[PDB]
Amino acid sequence: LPPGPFPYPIVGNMLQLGANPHQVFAKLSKRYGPLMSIHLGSLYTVIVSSPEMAKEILHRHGQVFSGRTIAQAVHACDHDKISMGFLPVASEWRDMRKICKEQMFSNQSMEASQGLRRQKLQQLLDHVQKCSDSGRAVDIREAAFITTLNLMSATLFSSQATEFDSKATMEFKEIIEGVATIVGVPNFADYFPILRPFDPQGVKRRADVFFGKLLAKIEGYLNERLESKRANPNAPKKDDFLEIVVDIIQANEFKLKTHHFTHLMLDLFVGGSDTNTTSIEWAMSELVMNPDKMARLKAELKSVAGDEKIVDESAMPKLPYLQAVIKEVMRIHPPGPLLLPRKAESDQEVNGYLIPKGTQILINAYAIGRDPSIWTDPETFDPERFLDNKIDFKGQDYELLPFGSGRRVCPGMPLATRILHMATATLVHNFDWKLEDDSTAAADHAGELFGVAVRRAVPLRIIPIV
Ligand code: HEM
Ligand SMILES: CC(C)C1=CCC2=C(CC[C@H]3C(C)(C)CCC[C@]23C)C1
Numbered sequence: 209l210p211p212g213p214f215p216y217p218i219v220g221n222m223l224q225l226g227a228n229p230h231q232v233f234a235k236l237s238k239r240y241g242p243l244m245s246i247h248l249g250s251l252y253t254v255i256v257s258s259p260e261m262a263k264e265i266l267h268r269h270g271q272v273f274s275g276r277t278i279a280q281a282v283h284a285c286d287h288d289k290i291s292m293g294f295l296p297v298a299s300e301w302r303d304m305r306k307i308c309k310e311q312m313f314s315n316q317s318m319e320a321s322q323g324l325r326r327q328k329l330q331q332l333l334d335h336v337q338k339c340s341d342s343g344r345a346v347d348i349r350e351a352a353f354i355t356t357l358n359l360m361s362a363t364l365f366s367s368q369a370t371e372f373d374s375k376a377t378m379e380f381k382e383i384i385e386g387v388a389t390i391v392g393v394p395n396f397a398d399y400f401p402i403l404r405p406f407d408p409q410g411v412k413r414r415a416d417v418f419f420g421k422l423l424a425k426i427e428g429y430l431n432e433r434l435e436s437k438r439a440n441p442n443a444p445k446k447d448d449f450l451e452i453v454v455d456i457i458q459a460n461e462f463k464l465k466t467h468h469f470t471h472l473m474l475d476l477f478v479g480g481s482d483t484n485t486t487s488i489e490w491a492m493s494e495l496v497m498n499p500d501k502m503a504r505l506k507a508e509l510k511s512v513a514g515d516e517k518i519v520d521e522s523a524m525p526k527l528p529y530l531q532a533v534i535k536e537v538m539r540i541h542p543p544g545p546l547l548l549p550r551k552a553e554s555d556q557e558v559n560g561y562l563i564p565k566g567t568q569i570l571i572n573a574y575a576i577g578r579d580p581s582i583w584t585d586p587e588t589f590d591p592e593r594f595l596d597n598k599i600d601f602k603g604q605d606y607e608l609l610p611f612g613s614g615r616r617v618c619p620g621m622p623l624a625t626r627i628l629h630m631a632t633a634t635l636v637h638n639f640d641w642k643l644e645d646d647s648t649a650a651a652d653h654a655g656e657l658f659g660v661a662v663r664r665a666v667p668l669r670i671i672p673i674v
Contacts, residue, residue, distance in 0.1 A: 210254055210561040212236070212245030220247025222399065228658045230545035233257070234575035243561055249399030251277075253568040255546075257575040259582065259606035264558050265550070265569060266606075266614035271297070274615040275551035277568040280397045280404060281390055284415035285423060290471045293479075296553070297615055303462045304472055308619040311452050312476075318622050320447035322521045324362040325626065328355065329518050329634050335372045336639060340672040345644035349667040352488035352631065353481075357381055359627050360480050364473060365429050366448040379425070384481045386418045392659035419474070426473045430454070430466075449473065479620050483543040484627045486663040490541040491533065491632045493668045494589045496641055497653050501591060505529055509637040519633045521626050527633070532594035534628050538577075538601050538610040540589065543661035545574030547612050573609045574662075582607050639672035 213236060215221050225232050233255050237244050242258030256262050265273045274297040282288045289295070292304040311317060332355045339346050354373055357380045361367035369376060395411040397403040407413060433450050436443075445451055453469045456462060495502040508529040513519050524531065550569035555562060563569075578586045584593070599605045602621070603613030611618035618624070635641075643649055652666040 210243040210245045210563070211240045212247075213240065215245075215247035218249070220249050220399075222248055222394075228656055228662075230572060230574045230658070230662070231656075233546070233570075233572050234578065237572065237575060243559060243563075248568075249396075250401055251399045251568060252564070252566075253570055254563055255570050255572055257572045257579075259576060261559065262571055262576065262606045262609060262613070266571070266603075266609075266612070269556055269558065270614040272553050272556045273550045273569055275553045276616070277549040277551045279391065280395055280407065281411050281415045283412050284419040287419060287471060287474075290467055291475055292472055292619075293475050293548070300464065300468070303464055304468065305619060307452075307456060307462070307472075308476075311456070312449050313619060313622040315622075317447070317449075317452070318626060319522070321363045322626075324366060324447060325359050325521070325630065326518055328358040328362050329630055331358065331370075331372045332631070333517060333634055333638060336635065336672050340639060340674065343671065345669040345671045347667050347669055348489050348492050349485065349663070352492075353381060353384075353485045354378075355631055356481055356484040356488065356627060357384070359484075359631070360477055360623075362448075363623060364449045364477060366446050366450065380422075380477075380481075383418050383421050384478060387415065387478065388482060388660045390414050390418070422474055422477070423470055426470045426477075430470060430473075449476070476620060479618075480624055480627065482659075482661040484624055484631070486543050486661040487534075487537060487541065487628055488631045489664060489668055491537045491628070492635060492641070492670065493653055493664060494537060494540070495533070495636065496643060496668070496670055497649065498589045501533070501589060502636065502641075504591075505533055505636055509633060513633075513637060517634075517638055519630060519637065521630060524626075524629055527629070528595060529591060530629055530633055532591035532597075534625070534632065535594045535599075535601060535608070536589060536591040537628075539583070539608055540577060540587075541662070542573045542577060542610040543663075544610075545572065545662050546570040547573055547609070548616075550616070571609060571612070573612075576607060576609060635672075639674055641670040641672055644669040644671055 213221055213224065237255060237257040242256065242261040244255045244257065246253045246255055256265050276294045278288045278294050282294055292301055295301045332351065336346055354377060357377050361377065361380065367376060390411055395409055397407060429450055430453065433454055437454060457466065457469065495505065508527060512523060512526050552563050552565050552567040552569065554565050576582065580586050599608055601608045601610050603609065603611060603617045611621050652664065655665040656662050657665040
C-alpha cells in the first residue's frame with residue numbers, strides 16, 4: 209500500500225485531521241509522498257498530491273478510478289442511485305453527461321442565456337449602488353451567494369424575480385445552507401460501516417428534508433413548464449435548461465426516467481451554488497488585499513468596457529487579466545480542495561503500490577496548487593503568472609485541477625466561468641472598495657473554514673465607493 213502516517217486502532221488517522229484536513233494532508237504528503245494512505249476509520253483512502261500522480265490516476269488509469277465514493281448523506285431520496293454525480297460510468301451516466309456537454313453547456317446554450325444572466329447582474333449592480341450611497345459595507349459572502357443563486361436560477365429555470373433577494377431565491381438559500389450544515393460535519397456512519405444502518409447522527413434523515421424541498425421546487429417548475437408549453441404552442445421557446453429537459457423528455461430518445469432529469473437539475477443547481485459563492489468572495493478578497501492587482505484589473509475593464517456598466521460575457525476573450533485573476537483564485541482557493549472523491553473500480557498498481565478495489569481517491573488540488581516545487585512564490589496572489597501562459601483549468605494541466613480532470617471532470621465549467629468572471633467584473637468595474645475594518649485584515653484573509661466549499665471564516669465586508 210502507499211506509505212502514510214501510522215493509523216491507530218479504531219480511528220485510523222482521523223484524530224489528526226483537524227478543522228482543515230486539506231491543509232493537514234498537504235503537510236503530510238511532504239513527508240510521505242504524492243500517493244499517501246490515510247485511514248478515515250475503516251474508510252481506506254489514498255491522497256494524490258502531485259501533478260504526476262494526478263495524471264496517472266485521472267488519465268492513464270482514468271477508467272479504473274472513474275467511480276465515486278458515496279457519502280451516506282447522498283442516499284437521501286435515493287439520489288445515490290439516480291445522480292450523474294455518483295452513478296458509475298455506464299449507460300445512464302453517459303447519457304446524462306452527453307446531455308450536459310452537447311445541449312445544456314453548449315456554446316449555443318450559454319450564449320442564448322447570456323441575457324437572462326445580464327438582468328441578474330444588473331440587479332446586483334443596483335443593490336450595491338444603494339449600499340454605496342448609504343456608505344454601508346457590503347457582506348460579499350451574502351451578496352455573492354444571492355447573485356449566484358439568481359444567476360443559476362435564471363439559467364436553469366428562467367426565474368423571473370425583479371427583486372435581488374426574492375422570496376424564491378431566499379428559499380433556495382435556506383436549502384443550500386441547510387445541505388452545507390449537514391454534509392459539512394463528519395458523519396461517523398461514513399467511517400464505521402457498523403453505524404450505517406443506524407444513521408446515528410440523523411444526517412441522512414436531515415438531508416432528506418432538504419433534498420425533498422429542492423426536488424419539490426424543481427418538479428413544480430418542470431410541471432409548470434410542461435403545462436405552459438401545452439397551452440401556448442406558439443409562444444417563443446425559453447433559453448433555459450428546463451426547456452431542454454422538456455424537449456428531451458418528449459422526444460423520448462434516452463432511456464432515462466423523469467427523476468433522472470429532476471435529480472440532474474438538483475445536481476446542477478447545488479453544483480454551482482457554494483462553489484461560485486465562495487470563489488467570488490475569495491476573488492474580491494484577494495483583489496482588496498493586493499491593491500496593485502485591483503488597479504490592473506480595473507484598468508483592463510476600463511479599456512474594454514469603458515462607461516458600460518455590465519460587461520458582455522461575449523467579451524471574455526478581450527479580458528485576459530480577468531481570466532488570469534480567476535485562474536489564480538482557482539489555483540490558491542479551489543472551492544473543493546480535495547475535489548469530489550473518486551473510487552478504484554478494481555485493484556490497480558500505481559508507482560509500485562497496490563491500490564485496492566474500493567479505495568477512496570482524493571485529489572489534493574489545493575496542495576498541488578500551493579506546492580513550491582511547482583509554482584514560484586506559491587502563497588502570493590500573482591495573476592500575471594498566467595498571462596501568455598497556456599496553463600488552464602480545463603483538466604489538461606495537472607498543476608491546476610480545480611474542476612478535476614478525466615472521466616468525471618466538472619461538466620458545469622462553462623457556466624461556472626461565466627458566473628465567476630461576470631460577478632467579479634461587475635463588482636470591480638463599478639466601484640472602488642475599502643475594508644470596513646483592516647485591524648485584523650491579514651488574519652481574516654488567511655483563516656479558512658472547511659466544508660462543502662472552503663471559505664473565509666470571517667466574511668469579507670467591504671464598502672463600495674465611486
Ligand atoms: C464554480 C466552480 C466549480 C468548481 C470548482 C467545480 C468543481 C468540480 C469538481 C472538482 C468536480 C469533480 C470532478 C472530478 O471528479 O474529476 C465537479 C463535478 C461536478 N460539477 Fe462542478 N464545479 C464548479 C461549478 C459547477 C457548476 C456551475 C455546475 C453546474 C452547473 C457543476 C456541476 C457539477 C457536476 C454535476 C459534477 C459531477 C460530475 C460527474 O461526476 O460526472 N459544477 N465539479
Ligand atoms: C461542482 C462540484 C464541486 C460538486 C460537488 C458537490 C455536488 C455536486 C453536484 C451534486 C451534489 C449532490 C448530488 C446534490 C450531492 C452533494 C454534492 C453534489 C454532488 C457537484
